[PDB]
């Protein structure tokens, strides 16, 4: 099993971009998807200030140069987790995109939770699912806020359960506890569709690459 | 299972300390990936603070030169009866045409704001753009 | 390679300047009885009431003329440290884009 490990699980970690996630997007694409459009300055969160290019007539603009690097890192992490057969859970309480996110999760063979988050999904999983339940290895927040404009409880619960989190953070969101924050617009349907497309493509490509590498290793 | 003190360090530091301490038999699936490709900022909890006194946010207002022209255009000829099409990535409003002509005259002539404005208006009317003051 | 600064500077939304009393073209993308949800290229959509005149012509995909009043409706309320947003834009429905 040592050769298996070294050739399959350790090899992808020796390359900066093993899954070529950098070709899935560009600053032009993010701009065309309206990823740079934030909330008004009155709704700004302090910890989002380093990610803000500036305010245009009292409307915050998200610096897409930083969004590009953050998204590169987040997509790379997601692809690596999917390659390792980790359980990926998408979470979002925006009802405008519940159907889209559930469809995307079903399509890439991952899991979705767009509904009311009951107390104890993650911190009390053994009682609520069973003593042998396996929790997600990665959680992806398309929307980090709930419908009362407060953080999704799953952010703190995932931090408690030591589950890394990728997250789309708008100008009124708190990115402190998200492992891989991605500054961007989370309201426009174009931006959400782009995020779903990028994550789905990354996960499917990573799973296909894992299968191909397994097949090649078995053949040789 | 790992430490549930989400406000002490980060998931990475907690997991690493527990692993080296022998509490966790094996690293979790994400630990190696985090090692190879770490985030730009370590996800450490921090309590947001209200600013007081002279402290101010470092966020600047986005302004351009032509904004001045735009403003005064919008103050003289008003908002164009034509409708903006924000879906078109290369939409060109009447005000934007006025701005481009103003800048062209500025680089092909002197710098007198009123003279530039009147001359640009004359040029646009000559081209065939209606402009009701 | 176009930088983000250039794209922002030459963006139609940036060129529009203030959004008050600006005429825009929006597209209907959702119908709820007589509630028309219209996208006009901003961060948020606007919800308008179906006009009583030629109301049957307002359907999904229809292009309409709007007068923008606010790109996002927010307001700080007494005893609050942050603004409250309705996640919606304010606009007046004028008619159908011929």
């Amino acid at each position: 099993s040592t050769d298996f490990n070294d050739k399959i699980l350790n090899e992808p970690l020796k390359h900066s971009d093993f899954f070529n996630v950098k070709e899935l997007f560009s600053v032009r694409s993010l701009f065309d998807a309206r990823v740079h459009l934030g909330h008004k300055a009155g709704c700004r969160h302090r910890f989002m200030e380093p990610y803000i290019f500036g305010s245009r007539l009292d409307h915050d603009i998200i610096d897409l140069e930083q969004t590009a690097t953050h998204l590169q890192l987040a997509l790379n992490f997601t692809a690596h987790m999917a390659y390792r057969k980790g359980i990926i859970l998408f979470i979002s309480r925006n009802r405008q995109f519940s159907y889209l996110i559930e469809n995307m999760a079903r399509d890439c063979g991952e899991y979705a939770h767009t509904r009311y988050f009951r107390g104890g999904m993650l911190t009390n999983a053994r009682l609520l699912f069973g003593p042998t339940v396996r929790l997600p290895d990665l959680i992806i927040f398309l929307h980090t806020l709930n419908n009362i404009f407060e953080p999704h409880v799953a952010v703190r619960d995932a931090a408690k359960m030591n589950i890394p989190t990728v997250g789309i953070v708008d100008t009124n969101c708190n990115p402190c506890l998200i492992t891989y924050p991605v500054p961007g617009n989370d309201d426009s349907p174009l931006a959400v569709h782009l995020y779903c497309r990028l994550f789905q493509t990354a996960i499917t490509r990573a799973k296909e690459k894992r299968q191909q590498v397994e097949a090649l290793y078995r053949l040789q | 299972a790992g430490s549930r003190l989400e406000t002490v360090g980060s998931i990475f530091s907690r997991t690493r300390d527990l692993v080296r301490a022998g509490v966790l038999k094996e690293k979790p699936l994400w630990f190696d990936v985090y090692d190879a490709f770490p985030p730009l900022r370590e996800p450490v909890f921090q309590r947001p603070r209200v600013r007081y006194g002279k402290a101010k946010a470092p966020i600047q207002d986005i302004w351009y030169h032509e904004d001045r022209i735009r403003a005064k255009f919008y103050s003289v000829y008003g908002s164009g009866q034509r409708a903006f099409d924000l879906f078109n990535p290369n939409f060109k409003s009447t005000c934007q045409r006025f701005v481009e002509k103003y800048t062209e005259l500025q680089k092909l002539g002197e710098t007198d704001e009123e003279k530039l404005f009147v001359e640009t208006g004359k040029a646009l009317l000559a081209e065939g753009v209606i402009l009701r003051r | 390679v176009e930088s983000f600064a250039s794209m922002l500077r030459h963006s139609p939304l940036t060129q529009m300047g203030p959004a008050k009393d600006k005429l825009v073209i929006g597209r209907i993308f959702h119908i709820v009885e007589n509630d028309l949800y219209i996208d006009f290229g901003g961060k948020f959509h606007c919800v308008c009431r179906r006009p009583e005149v030629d109301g049957e012509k307002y359907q999904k995909g229809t292009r309409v003329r709007l007068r923008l009043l606010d790109l996002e409706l927010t307001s700080r309320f007494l005893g609050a440290t942050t603004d409250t947003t309705v996640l919606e834009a304010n606009a007046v429905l004028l008619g159908i884009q011929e």
């Binding site: - | 600047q60 351009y64 030169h65 904004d67 735009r70 919008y74 | 930088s3 922002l8």
Partner: peptide, 25 residues
Amino acid sequence: NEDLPISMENPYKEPLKKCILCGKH
């Protein structure tokens, strides 16, 4: 880069509203 924003006072700033007797004795 020449496309960066520049510092100025708000050019779209509407004049402050005045009462009907403003400037009158």
